[PDB]
Design an enzyme around this catalytic site. Structure first.
Site, PDB file in Angstrom:
ATOM      1  N   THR A 113       7.201  20.361 -53.644  1.00 40.04           N
ATOM      2  CA  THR A 113       6.278  20.634 -54.880  1.00 40.04           C
ATOM      3  C   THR A 113       6.482  19.091 -55.686  1.00 40.04           C
ATOM      4  O   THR A 113       7.539  18.552 -55.233  1.00 40.04           O
ATOM      5  CB  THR A 113       6.873  21.685 -55.670  1.00 40.04           C
ATOM      6  OG1 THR A 113       8.024  21.200 -56.620  1.00 40.04           O
ATOM      7  CG2 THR A 113       6.956  22.961 -55.066  1.00 40.04           C
ATOM      8  N   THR A 114       5.687  18.836 -56.477  1.00 35.03           N
ATOM      9  CA  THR A 114       5.722  17.474 -57.155  1.00 35.03           C
ATOM     10  C   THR A 114       6.630  17.588 -58.313  1.00 35.03           C
ATOM     11  O   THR A 114       6.818  18.604 -59.048  1.00 35.03           O
ATOM     12  CB  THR A 114       4.123  17.228 -57.854  1.00 35.03           C
ATOM     13  OG1 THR A 114       3.274  17.387 -56.573  1.00 35.03           O
ATOM     14  CG2 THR A 114       4.202  15.920 -58.226  1.00 35.03           C
TER      15      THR A 114
END
Ligand SMILES: [Mg+2]
Ligand SMILES: [Mg+2]
Ligand SMILES: [Mg+2]
Ligand SMILES: [Mg+2]
Ligand SMILES: [Mg+2]
Ligand SMILES: [Mg+2]
Ligand SMILES: [Mg+2]
Lengths: 241, 231, 204, 250, 195, 196, 243, 244, 226
Positions: free
Chosen positions: G30-31
């Protein structure tokens, strides 16, 4: 094909993992150069900050190992810092045990021995770096000693390291074939730095701004690196001659 | 494929196959469901026998008065991890006179599992765990995977055909979360969730395992006659 | 109580012209009780002679240890160990037990087979080398021996005059020590012959 | 971590070959030529200082090394392997001999210790053999002058004269013609220089040749006076100037 | 414990050892055998600290019996005595030393000679015609010095022994309850069961 | 032994006598008890000469290694390293150490580390056997923010009295001045300080 | 070939393929981002809502080291936790010996050397995370990003995970359109926006935003989680900008 | 991790053989021939050096025959460096025994300990075996004159006459033919040299390619002497037995 | 024992008496107490004699190895640092008290070292039972900028004060001089003020005076051939 993967001999008596470690040494695409004055030793290195999100003050391949010894590295930064931390520990321990500052050539030998061990012991990989140590030694004077992943080391009148090392090397050889002496016959380190930058410019065929270089200077009793503004002052004096 | 011989090896796409194979043992395990309100937390587990002469493998383990878990996969790995939990709950009581927060228990399990995914000679744990507990911040349900991933949830299920129960709980979320102060209803809802994972077999008196923990309820396990009330 | 004077005993060594001598009493006791009159305290490894006084168990142990080490030395070097070299080996071996030492007073005597020079040396229990030219003494009657040797000794005695000097030094020293005597041996050492003489003495 | 290579990396193949040792010897074959010659009153050892770049200060790289005051060593093969062996050889001369006997070891025994170290790298877990052959020259009281070769396997042999590396087969032939049992040290040096010229490509002078002798005691190199019996080291490294002096009458 | 004596005559070795075992205030036993057979022609008697004496003796016996089986050969008395001495010398610098004194009587079948070795707890070894440990020598040695001959028979040896034990029984303050006597010769080891 | 360190407006000054005794024998009458552990972090030593030299050398090592990695250490940091050594090895050490240093942010600082290995930050500190005789004098005469010359006089007058009464103290008075300007060594001889 | 089967083996081009494969696990996460501001740093991360059954606010990903350093990472979450535990031991030991809390550049090298060590042997696997971390020390604010090779540099802003390209571009704009500075409070809002913008590349699932910060003026140089009103505000600022 | 590069030096083949031991024995079969012959009044050890050069210093060289103690010697066939490791271990064992018992070590006990060491390398530790076969010649007062061999498996056996190294099949046949129990040392010397003369791969047999030794009671009155032959003495015995 | 060290113009000198004692008894009348750590670094020891010798040899050995490794001539500060760390580790149980003197590329040096591991610097030092007698002389006559000749004179006079006034010291004076840029000169028995006077009488015995029971030839050779 497992003599390719660990540090055992191939049928022609070669260590392939050592050879491939020499190749990793140029991954950063940076060239560096070291020269000796009368009273000083100068090391310059290209500085490349390709991303705009980086803090350029933290981007560096020059290390202050001890108060007298500087080290420039050609190779990936993690292996460079591994070597830098070790050399700092070694130099500090040497001073504690033997009561005097570790000479540049002795530190170079020590790090070269550590590298040799990685070429003989299977569980340790070689470090993909070339280390150039500089100082003004109290017995030998201005000194350049360079170490590689084979565990080889030797002293130098001057030297260069990186993808374009040959051009810089031949450029330097030609100057010393002329001058017929072991060093740059110059009093001030400022003028030795100017010589260093000038001859890199000619050999590479490129121009430098104050943010394209990194400069380390060794004098009697301290090694230091120049700021962007000290380098600018160097660049300005070069242009006006 | 060339990259699945040990846990110390990434695939070219960055996967860890030994860990994924450990995850696969859980999928083969018998289904177990967990869910909670604000006052209680419940584990329901379908126990699996070997044949009709054999006993049904126990799936629920007590860790402390306020905490316990259910397992799916390699049972001996659950015994190792639950024993570790018992010790950590115990350490917290003896040294700090403090009941171990369910969230800390999850972090400790994660770190224990992780070490077996990064070194040579080890293997990952081959069991999944559902941990319920009641501590100073109320009721909790955790899901542990042997990859080391631990997650706090309102409800979930793991094991063979857990997906049915997992969707049922997803629908019922807004209803079962409000079952406060009524333990029997919370269990009922858990038994109903686990029923969505059954095919062929149905819930019987030596088949079903239920545990509950909450406000004024020590972690306790119901088997045998004690689950008749809920079938 | 004092370990170096439980068993008693003495050793003395002297240099003369192209020769050395080393002598010792033969007593072994347990304090006042005389136990044996045949306890020789001089050993040799090739042409190097070692006298050891002090605690008798350590005397025995050290002889067995130096026999061991000089035998391995010979096999490796393919020549017999020399007196100067052996002296350093004794010193090293004793100091390696600095904090749990052997309770002994060793004495080395020999002639260097190459140079022909006569050699003697003494040690404390912990390896300190005493390298006197004239004489070395050790044991429970060492004060008496220093007295005899100092007055009787002169340099460059011929082998058979040296014999009389060292014999008289040992005998009269032993007679003033309760824990020494009960017989005596004297080695006269030349570059190619070694003679060993047992002395007649009072047996009280 | 932990070194988990606790098994041998050198093993017998079906034909009885120890592969890694043979391959180590192959690395020695590629090495720069070095040689030794024994005379009646000394020993000479020599080699080429092949500098990697002209910016290198080649006097800072010592191919011929003092091991003890009376013992010296030269090599062919991998320089870094040689450098660590010299460190270990110097240390073992002290730990397993001088601290015991109060004197430096005789040549054969120091050679024996170096050989043992090299043998262990051929059987111990997780290591490769050393990729060097050594020539060790020295003097001691009871054996006089001697010259030994040590190979990657740990095998050592005494020579009257020999050569190792690149052009060893040709150099050995040259040495068989000229060596006799009546050579004086100056004659042996002269032969060493003549032999070495054949395997050397370009510049051949005092700055490209490294040469040392085991000869007479040098009291001027002792550093102190007043102990008649201490007479100084027999190992001496010839200067650039001393080599060039002998290259005229060549 | 207390008194152990040994005497080597022409063709055998005789060992005499007291029978009493005393725990401070009471005599617990008056028939204790303070000896172990190490091999068919070697016998060891022992005295010193409670517990350590028997532990040491049985440990030595086990080691010699092991050697005998491994080599199918009996060690000479000299070799056995050197092994025993080394163990006691090793023990004196231990954390807690064996406080045990021994006499080793053996008949050497190769040299056809009886042999008596006296070894104290420090590892002090001596070969003797006759020997003792503790205070036993103080009462008996003047008789042995007087009467002993190297060519005595076994019976003459036993008679000289009776004279020694009688002097001990007269002048020693402790009642040691007589002695058990054993003879070691070319035919092995036997006990003299009337003394 | 008489040692002290005093903060003043421009930094800190360390002072010491030069006597070391073996019983009543003066084994060295010109000892240097002021030791450098970093450019502008110095210490005064009291107690066992072997212990304090060993500790000082180890701290100098730690700070040299600290500097290589993290740049110039604070005076507080230097005192913390001393403390660690003195506290963890209290059973085997007899060391009383005063640590004095100059920062640009923090200025002059003084930390005393007595026998048990506790640490105490102070405006000034005194220690050693001779210090007992000047507790009254130093308490009455010390002011904050003195000038360099007032501070030199305070130390000189103080150690002069310690030397006068304590037989274990004597010789020359050494001082080390730590400021932004740099590092200055001072020395004062008996004929100067005795007649104060 | 077979150079990629074992950690610490150099390929014939001089590469460690196992480390490059570790990066793939990072690129699959995930970012997460970090923004350096005038007197501090802001950290933000995207938490994917796998299901309604995840308790909101309760699976915290950002982690404190000591009291002045925040760390967030993308990739294998347990590897990140392992790295932070080591970071906490290193911070504790530094403060123990030297008294002062560990400087951020010092701390960065401690993590750097540890991560680099996991590329030296075949008996261990490289870390499957990129870690963004930083905080305030006595020389000001510092933001670092650390890769599986052990490589790290100081940053003005930084991003990793699946939406790293989008976030980088957004970060590059802030740097150009604020050459004199960005306030801690602005940076919190901007962090929210950039995560919302980067969430395009993980669109199948909806997500939960999580922010933390250390600021000399706003938090006294301590690391704190952005909670309650200030969080809601930055969520609103972000929601208005995606329309 | 590291398992990948492990040859597994200590495993059975499907036939129940130890690969590494078999291959070490193959290595040894290319080594210079060594021969031991036992007589009633002594033992002879004779061995061939592997091809020489004229510049090799012979009179100071030792490649084949080693003294373990005053009563025991060995002839070596195989890797010399491996042999020296084991030889020094055996020398130490001999002294340990002498120190402990005050008697010289019986020949078999020394041989068994060395063989047990060799055996260990074939069962545990994952290291390659020693590429060495020994012939042991010695004397003790129990069994008198004795000959043993040991090989990389750690098996040892006793012999009246035996060869190791190159051409053992041919050498064994020749010794089997001419050996007799009542034989004396001076005949055994002749037999050993004649056997090497016939089995050698060299053109002829000369002094510079031999090492030679005897263990004789030939020493004034009941005691044993070892004689490692000087090069001139080997030259004399070659002439005396009519081989040159 | 009396031992001194004295700095001068271009170097340093050390000296020692030559009596070694066993309690109140003289064991060796002409002991050499001046030891060599390296060619131009010399020392002399008081206290436990085996400890001073052992510690001198150990550090001398490690100094040589260090010098070979670094390709530099040994420094006095290195000898000092290695001695004090070795001694400190053993907490005074190694009873070595030393004066260490030498010259190296850095200059001339003079140090004392105490058994527990403390060290001291000075222009003049003394050690041993005669150290107070010697120091009385050094404190009376020492000045700044001594010549080589004055320093040898001062140092040997200081030893003489120990020889005559300290019962622990006696016999002869040994001196070693280490001047910068020169070889160290070791002057064994530099002074000889204590020759034993000739005795009144010869104590040579008539041959056959001593009574003998047995003679035998000892076989020192190895086993004979044939
Ligand atoms: Mg390697
Ligand atoms: Mg007497
Ligand atoms: Mg009497
Ligand atoms: Mg008597
Ligand atoms: Mg006894
Ligand atoms: Mg005073
Ligand atoms: Mg202390």
């Amino acid at each position: 094909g497992y003599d390719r993967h660990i540090t055992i001999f191939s049928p022609e008596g070669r260590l392939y993992q050592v050879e491939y470690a020499f190749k990793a040494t140029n991954q950063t695409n940076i060239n560096s150069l070291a020269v000796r004055g009368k009273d000083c030793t100068v090391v310059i290195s290209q500085k490349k900050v390709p991303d705009k999100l980086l803090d350029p003050t933290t981007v560096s391949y020059i290390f202050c190992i001890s108060r007298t010894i500087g080290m420039v590295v050609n190779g990936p930064i993690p292996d460079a810092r591994n070597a830098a931390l070790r050399a700092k520990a070694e130099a500090a321990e040497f001073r504690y045990k033997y009561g005097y500052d570790m000479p540049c050539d002795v530190l170079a030998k020590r790090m070269a021995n550590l590298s040799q061990i990685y070429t003989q012991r299977a569980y340790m990989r070689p470090l993909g770096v070339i280390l150039t140590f500089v100082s003004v030694d109290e017995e030998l004077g201005p000194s350049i000693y360079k170490t590689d992943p084979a565990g080889y080391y030797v002293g130098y009148k001057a030297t260069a390291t990186g993808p374009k090392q040959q051009e810089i090397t031949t450029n330097l050889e030609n100057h010393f074939k002329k001058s017929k002496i072991d060093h740059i016959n110059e009093e001030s380190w400022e003028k030795v730095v100017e010589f260093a930058i000038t001859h890199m410019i000619d050999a590479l065929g490129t121009e430098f701004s104050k943010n394209d270089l990194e400069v380390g200077v060794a004098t009697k009793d301290k090694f230091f690196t120049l700021s962007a503004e000290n380098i600018e002052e160097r660049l300005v004096a070069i242009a006006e001659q | 494929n060339n990259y699945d011989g040990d846990t110390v090896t990434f695939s070219p796409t960055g996967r860890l196959f030994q860990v994924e194979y450990a995850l696969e043992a859980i999928k083969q395990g018998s289904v177990t469901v967990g869910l909670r309100s604000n006052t209680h937390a419940v584990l329901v587990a379908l126990k699996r026998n070997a044949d009709e002469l054999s006993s049904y493998q126990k799936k629920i383990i007590k860790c402390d008065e306020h905490m316990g878990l259910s397992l799916a996969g390699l049972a001996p790995d659950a015994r190792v991890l639950s024993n570790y939990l018992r010790q950590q709950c115990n350490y917290s009581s003896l040294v700090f006179n403090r009941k171990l927060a369910v969230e800390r228990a999850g972090h400790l399990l994660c770190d224990k599992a992780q070490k077996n995914t990064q070194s040579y000679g080890g293997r990952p744990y081959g069991v999944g765990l559902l941990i319920i507990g009641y501590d100073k911040s109320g009721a909790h349900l955790l899901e542990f995977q042997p990859s080391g991933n631990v997650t706090e949830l309102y409800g979930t299920a793991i094991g063979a055909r857990s997906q049915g129960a997992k969707t049922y709980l997803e629908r019922t979320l807004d209803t079962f979360i409000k079952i406060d102060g009524n333990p029997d209803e919370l269990i009922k809802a858990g038994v109903e969730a686990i029923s969505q994972s059954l095919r062929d077999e149905s819930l019987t008196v030596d088949n079903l395992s239920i545990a509950i923990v909450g406000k004024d309820t020590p972690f306790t396990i119901y088997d045998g006659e004690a689950v008749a009330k809920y079938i | 109580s004092d370990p170096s004077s439980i068993n008693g005993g003495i050793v003395v060594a002297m240099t003369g012209k192209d020769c050395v001598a080393i002598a010792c009493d033969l007593r072994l006791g347990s304090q006042s009780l005389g136990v044996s009159n045949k306890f020789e305290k001089i050993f040799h490894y090739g042409h190097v002679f070692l006298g050891i006084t002090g605690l008798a168990t350590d005397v025995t142990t050290l002889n067995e240890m130096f026999r061991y080490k000089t035998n391995l030395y010979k096999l490796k070097e393919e020549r017999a160990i020399e007196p100067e070299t052996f002296t350093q080996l004794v010193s090293s071996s004793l100091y390696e037990r600095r904090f749990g030492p052997y309770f002994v007073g060793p004495v080395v005597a020999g002639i260097n087979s190459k140079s022909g020079k006569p050699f003697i040396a003494g040690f404390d229990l912990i390896g300190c080398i005493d390298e006197a030219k004239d004489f070395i003494v050790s044991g429970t009657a060492s004060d008496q021996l220093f007295g005899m040797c100092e007055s009787l000794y002169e340099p460059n005695l011929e082998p058979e005059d040296l014999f009389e000097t060292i014999s008289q030094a040992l005998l009269n020293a032993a007679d003033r020590d309760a824990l020494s005597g009960w017989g005596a041996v004297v080695y006269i050492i030349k570059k190619d012959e070694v003679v060993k003489r047992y002395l007649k003495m009072r047996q009280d | 971590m932990t070194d988990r290579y606790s098994f041998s990396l050198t093993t017998f193949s079906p034909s009885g070959k120890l592969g890694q040792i043979d391959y180590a010897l192959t690395a020695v074959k590629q090495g720069v030529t070095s040689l030794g010659i024994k005379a009646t009153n000394g020993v000479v050892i020599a080699t080429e200082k092949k500098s990697s770049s002209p910016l290198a200060m080649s006097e800072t790289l010592s191919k011929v090394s003092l091991l003890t005051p009376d013992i010296g060593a030269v090599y062919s093969g991998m320089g870094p392997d040689y450098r660590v062996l010299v460190d270990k050889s110097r240390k073992v001369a002290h730990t397993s001999y001088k601290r015991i006997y109060g004197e430096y070891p005789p040549t054969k025994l120091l050679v024996s210790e170096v050989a043992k170290i090299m043998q262990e790298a051929t059987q111990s877990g997780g290591v490769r053999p050393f990729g060097v052959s050594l020539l060790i020259a020295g003097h001691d009281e009871f054996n006089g002058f001697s010259l030994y070769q040590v190979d990657p396997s740990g095998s050592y042999f005494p020579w009257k004269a020999t050569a190792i590396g690149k052009g060893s087969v040709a150099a050995k032939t040259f040495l068989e013609k000229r060596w006799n049992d009546e050579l004086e040290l100056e004659d042996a040096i002269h032969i060493a220089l003549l032999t070495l010229k054949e395997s050397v490509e370009g510049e051949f002078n005092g700055d490209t040749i490294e040469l040392a002798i085991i000869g007479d005691e040098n009291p001027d190199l002792l550093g102190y006076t007043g102990i008649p019996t201490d007479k100084g080291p027999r190992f001496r490294k010839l200067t650039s100037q001393e080599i060039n002096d002998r290259l005229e009458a060549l | 414990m207390d008194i152990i004596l040994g005497i080597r005559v022409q063709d055998s070795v005789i060992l005499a050892s007291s029978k009493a075992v005393t725990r401070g205030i009471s005599v617990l036993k008056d028939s204790d055998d303070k000896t172990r057979q190490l091999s068919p022609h070697t016998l060891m008697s022992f005295a010193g600290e409670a517990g350590d004496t028997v532990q040491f003796a049985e440990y030595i016996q086990a080691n010699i019996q092991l050697y005998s089986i491994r080599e199918d050969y009996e060690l000479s008395p000299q070799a056995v005595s050197s092994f025993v001495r080394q163990e006691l010398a090793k023990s004196i610098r231990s954390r807690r030393p064996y406080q045990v004194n021994v006499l080793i009587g053996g008949y050497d079948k190769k040299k056809n000679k009886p042999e008596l070795y006296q070894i104290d707890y420090l590892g002090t070894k001596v070969e003797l015609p006759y020997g003792a440990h503790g205070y036993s020598g103080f009462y008996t040695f003047s008789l042995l010095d007087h009467h002993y001959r190297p060519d005595m028979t076994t019976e003459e040896g036993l008679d000289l022994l009776k004279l020694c034990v009688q002097e001990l029984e007269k002048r020693m303050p402790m009642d040691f309850k007589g002695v058990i006597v054993k003879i070691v010769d070319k035919d092995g080891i036997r006990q003299v069961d009337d003394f | 032994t008489s040692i002290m360190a005093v903060t003043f407006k421009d930094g800190v000054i360390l002072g010491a006598d030069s006597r070391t005794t073996t019983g009543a024998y003066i084994a060295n009458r010109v000892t240097d008890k002021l030791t450098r552990v970093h450019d502008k972090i110095w210490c005064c030593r009291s107690g066992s000469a072997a212990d304090t030299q060993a500790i000082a050398d180890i701290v100098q090592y730690h700070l040299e290694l600290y500097t290589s990695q993290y740049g110039t250490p604070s005076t507080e940091t230097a005192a913390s390293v001393f403390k660690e050594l003195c506290y963890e090895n209290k059973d085997n050490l007899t060391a009383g150490i005063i640590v004095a240093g100059y920062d640009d942010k923090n200025k002059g600082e003084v930390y005393t580390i007595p026998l048990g290995g506790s640490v105490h930050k102070l405006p000034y500190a005194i220690a050693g056997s001779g210090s007992t005789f000047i507790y009254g004098y130093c308490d009455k005469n010390f002011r904050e923010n003195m000038s360099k010359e007032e501070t030199v006089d305070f130390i000189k007058h103080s150690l002069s009295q310690a030397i006068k009464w304590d037989g274990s103290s004597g010789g020359v008075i050494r001082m080390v001045v730590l400021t932004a300007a740099g590092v200055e060594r001072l020395i004062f001889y008996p004929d100067e300080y005795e007649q104060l | 070939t077979g150079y990629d089967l074992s950690n610490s083996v150099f390929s014939p081009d001089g590469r460690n393929f196992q480390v490059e494969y570790a990066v793939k696990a990072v690129e699959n996460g995930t970012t997460s981002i970090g923004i350096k501001c005038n007197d501090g740093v802001v950290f933000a991360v995207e938490k994917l809502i796998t299901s309604k059954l995840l308790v909101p606010q309760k699976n915290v990903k950002i982690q404190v080291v000591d009291r002045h350093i925040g760390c967030v990472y993308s990739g294998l979450i347990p590897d990140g936790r392992h790295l932070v535990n080591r970071g906490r031991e290193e911070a504790a030991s530094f403060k123990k010996l030297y008294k002062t809390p560990i400087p951020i550049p010092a701390f960065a090298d401690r993590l750097g050397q540890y991560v680099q060590a996991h590329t030296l042997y075949n008996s261990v696997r490289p870390f499957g995370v990129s870690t963004i971390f930083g905080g305030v020390d006595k020389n000001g604010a510092h933001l670092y990003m650390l890769e599986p090779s052990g490589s790290y540099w100081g940053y003005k802003g930084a991003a990793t995970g699946k939406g790293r390209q989008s976030a980088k571009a957004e970060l590059e704009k802030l740097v150009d359109h604020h050459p004199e500075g960005l306030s801690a409070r602005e940076a919190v809002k901007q962090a929210a926006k950039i995560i919302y913008l980067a969430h395009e590349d993980n669109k199948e699932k909806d997500f939960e935003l999580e922010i933390s910060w250390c600021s000399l003026s706003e938090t006294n140089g301590l690391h704190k989680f952005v909670k309650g009103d200030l969080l809601q505000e930055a969520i609103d600022f972000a929601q208005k900008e995606i329309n | 991790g590291s398992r990948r590069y492990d040859s597994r030096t200590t495993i059975f083949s499907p036939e129940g053989r130890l690969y590494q031991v078999e291959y070490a024995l193959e290595s040894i079969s290319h080594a210079g021939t060594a021969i031991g012959i036992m007589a009633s009044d002594g033992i002879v050890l004779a061995a061939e050096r592997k091809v020489t050069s004229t510049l090799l210093e012979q009179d100071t060289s030792t490649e084949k025959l080693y003294k373990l103690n005053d009563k025991i010697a060995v002839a070596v066939a195989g890797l010399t460096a491996d042999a020296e490791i084991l030889i020094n271990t055996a020398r130490i064992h001999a002294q340990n025994y002498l120190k402990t018992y005050n008697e010289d070590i019986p020949v078999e006990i020394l041989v068994r300990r060395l063989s047990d060491i060799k055996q260990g390398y074939t069962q545990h530790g994952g290291l390659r075996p020693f590429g060495v076969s020994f012939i042991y010649a010695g004397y003790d007062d129990r069994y008198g004159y004795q000959l043993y061999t040991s090989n990389p498996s750690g098996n040892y056996t006793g012999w009246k006459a035996i060869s190791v190294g190159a051409n053992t099949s041919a050498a064994q046949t020749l010794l089997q033919m001419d050996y007799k129990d009542d034989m004396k040392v001076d005949d055994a010397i002749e037999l050993a040299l004649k056997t090497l003369s016939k089995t050698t791969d060299s053109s002829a047999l000369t002094y510079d390619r031999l090492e030679f030794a005897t263990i004789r009671k030939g020493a004034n009155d009941g005691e044993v002497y070892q004689k490692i032959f000087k090069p001139q003495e080997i030259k004399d015995i070659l002439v005396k037995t009519g081989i040159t | 024992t009396t031992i001194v060290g004295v700095k001068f113009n271009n170097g340093v000198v050390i000296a020692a008496d030559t009596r070694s004692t066993q309690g109140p008894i003289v064991a060796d009348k002409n002991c050499a107490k001046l030891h060599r750590i390296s060619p131009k670094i010399w020392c002399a020891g008081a206290g436990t004699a085996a400890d001073t010798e052992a510690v001198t040899q150990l550090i001398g050995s490690n100094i040589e190895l260090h010098s070979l490794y670094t390709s530099r001539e040994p420094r006095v500060v290195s000898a000092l640092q290695m001695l004090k760390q070795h001694l400190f580790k053993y907490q005074g149980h190694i009873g070595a008290y030393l004066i260490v003197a030498g010259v190296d590329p850095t200059g001339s040096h003079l140090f004392s070292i105490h058994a527990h591991g403390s060290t001291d610097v000075g222009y003049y030092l003394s050690l041993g039972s005669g150290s107070l007698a010697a120091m009385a002389v050094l404190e009376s006559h020492w000045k700044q900028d001594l010549t080589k000749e004055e320093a040898i004179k001062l140092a040997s006079d200081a030893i003489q004060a120990g020889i005559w006034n300290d019962l622990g010291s006696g016999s002869n004076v040994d001196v070693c001089v280490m001047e910068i840029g020169k070889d160290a000169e070791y002057l064994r028995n530099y002074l000889t003020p204590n020759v034993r006077e000739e005795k009144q009488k010869s104590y040579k015995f008539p041959r056959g005076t001593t009574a003998v029971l047995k003679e035998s030839i000892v076989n020192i050779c190895d086993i004979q051939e044939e």
